Design an enzyme around this catalytic site. Structure first.
Site, PDB file in Angstrom:
ATOM      1  N   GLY B 100      74.839 -22.987 -30.861  1.00 23.18           N
ATOM      2  CA  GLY B 100      75.249 -21.968 -31.822  1.00 23.18           C
ATOM      3  C   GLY B 100      74.153 -21.293 -32.611  1.00 23.18           C
ATOM      4  CD  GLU B 101      71.878 -24.640 -33.459  1.00 29.42           C
ATOM      5  OE1 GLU B 101      72.126 -24.525 -32.231  1.00 29.42           O
ATOM      6  OE2 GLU B 101      72.141 -25.688 -34.053  1.00 29.42           O
ATOM      7  CB  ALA B 102      70.477 -16.580 -33.732  1.00 30.51           C
ATOM      8  CE  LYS B 104      68.890 -25.410 -31.203  1.00 30.92           C
ATOM      9  NZ  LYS B 104      69.923 -26.406 -31.588  1.00 30.92           N
TER      10      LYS B 104
END
Ligand code: G3D
Ligand code: AFB
Ligand code: MG
Ligand code: ZN
Lengths: 179, 191
Positions: B100-102, B104
């Site tokens: 969910g981390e941008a 990544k």
């Protein structure tokens, strides 16, 4: 009865207001939101994609905006910055090695044309840590006294206790009713 | 039979992986069940036998040098020939659970885009165009199908968002409309 939501009780059925919250990884954004939702959990149906962390009081919403990634995707953000009345910038005040990186991120968000009129609330977070920079020191390191044509405030906070959250949002609420 | 022991140490290697991807790889490497090269770790992840897709995604999303090499090799194991962009993305995002981390997602979409373009040359003028558009499709899925988003993007907004990403110009409206419709009517499937 949500103390934070009661701050915004009389805006004026005015129009939805939208606040974005930004900060480097580990600054405390998720932790603040847990306090603003008062710790209440739901099982939410999963969705593939970005983590979305939002709290809605109705008449006002607060959304974490993740600034990670390369510069090439930032044009895509533009329509979301369009109806934004406020930006909350959260900084880890104990992280002296990354304070200039935080300043540069803030300064790039504040050059978005779409945010020209947004008010700015800085949470100088992690004040409970013994070697934390205080609000006066953060103000200097972020270059806030060089801002022009910007209504801004800095508030010392400890997100794990919630201390300072009420006072910064109360400042924010009074800015948003005044326009 | 010297082999059932191999199965025990594999099943152990996979659960650990499901609990902690790095520790499970280390365990598999130490017990000579898996080669410690990015290429072989990638094949192991791609076959994904008995592996939780969340653990695969978490491993592929790390920033350490080996994990970056594995992600490259992992994406090389995907065949995207004669797929449109969304079909390719569906296949890709079926093989692991997207983090969910941008930061990544960004790295994953660029890597995806390089491969998409190799498999389907001349569909896009540049890999940048493919990369930015793929990222905007991930954004669109999120917007449309995550219930924390109340004011859902319409076609017009989706078209306006991608203005300028074709090397400073625009992609055709029908290409963007078909992407928009595919995502709206069928979200990315949860693995
Ligand atoms: N001492 C201190 N810590 C705080 C404060 N605010 C947030 N933290 C901690 O810092 C870590 C990062 O916070 P988080 O809210 O996930 O940050 P982010 O969403 O901005 O990345 C968390 O610790 P973990 O990763 O250990 O859970 C959180 O508990 C604070 O005021 N004081
Ligand atoms: C309003 C919802 C829209 C969903 C799509 C937007 C995704 C953003 C893309 C950006 O790079 C990081 C995400 C950024 O963190 C968006 C958070 C979010 O809640 O946005
Ligand atoms: Mg967080
Ligand atoms: Zn390759």
């Amino acid at each position: 009865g949500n103390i934070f939501a009661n701050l915004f009780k009389g805006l004026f059925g005015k129009k939805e207001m939208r606040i974005l919250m930004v900060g480097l990884d580990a600054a405390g954004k998720t932790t603040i939101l847990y306090k603003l939702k008062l710790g209440e959990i739901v099982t939410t149906i999963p969705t593939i994609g970005f983590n979305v962390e939002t709290v809605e009081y109705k008449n006002i919403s607060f959304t974490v905006w993740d600034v990670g990634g390369q510069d090439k995707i930032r044009p895509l953000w533009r329509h979301y910055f369009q109806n934004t009345q406020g930006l909350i910038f959260v900084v880890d005040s104990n992280d002296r090695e990354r304070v200039n990186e935080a300043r540069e991120e803030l300064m790039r968000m504040l050059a978005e044309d779409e945010l020209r009129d947004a008010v700015l609330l800085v949470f100088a977070n992690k004040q409970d840590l013994p070697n934390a920079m205080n609000a006066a020191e953060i103000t200097d390191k972020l270059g806030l006294h060089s801002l022009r044509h910007r209504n801004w405030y800095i508030q010392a906070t400890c997100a794990t206790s919630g201390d300072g959250l009420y006072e910064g949002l109360d400042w924010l609420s009074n800015q948003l009713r005044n326009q | 039979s010297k082999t059932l022991q191999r199965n025990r140490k594999m099943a152990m290697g996979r659960k650990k992986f499901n609990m902690d991807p790095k520790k499970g790889i280390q365990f598999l490497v130490e017990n000579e069940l898996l080669q410690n090269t990015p290429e072989e770790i990638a094949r192991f992840l791609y076959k994904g036998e008995g592996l939780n897709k969340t653990a695969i995604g978490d491993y592929l999303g790390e920033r350490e040098e080996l994990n970056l090499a594995v992600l490259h090799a992992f994406v090389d194991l995907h065949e995207f020939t004669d797929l449109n962009l969304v079909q390719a993305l569906r296949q890709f995002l079926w093989s692991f659970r997207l983090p969910g981390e941008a930061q990544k997602i960004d790295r994953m979409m660029e890597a995806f885009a390089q491969r998409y373009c190799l498999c389907n040359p001349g569909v896009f003028q540049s890999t940048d165009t493919c990369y930015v558009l793929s990222y905007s499709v991930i954004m669109l899925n999120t917007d449309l199908h995550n219930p924390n988003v109340r004011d859902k993007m319409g076609l017009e907004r989706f078209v306006a968002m991608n203005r300028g990403i074709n090397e400073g110009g625009d992609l055709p409206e029908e290409l963007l409309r078909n992407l928009y419709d595919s995502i709206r009517n069928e979200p990315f499937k949860i693995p």
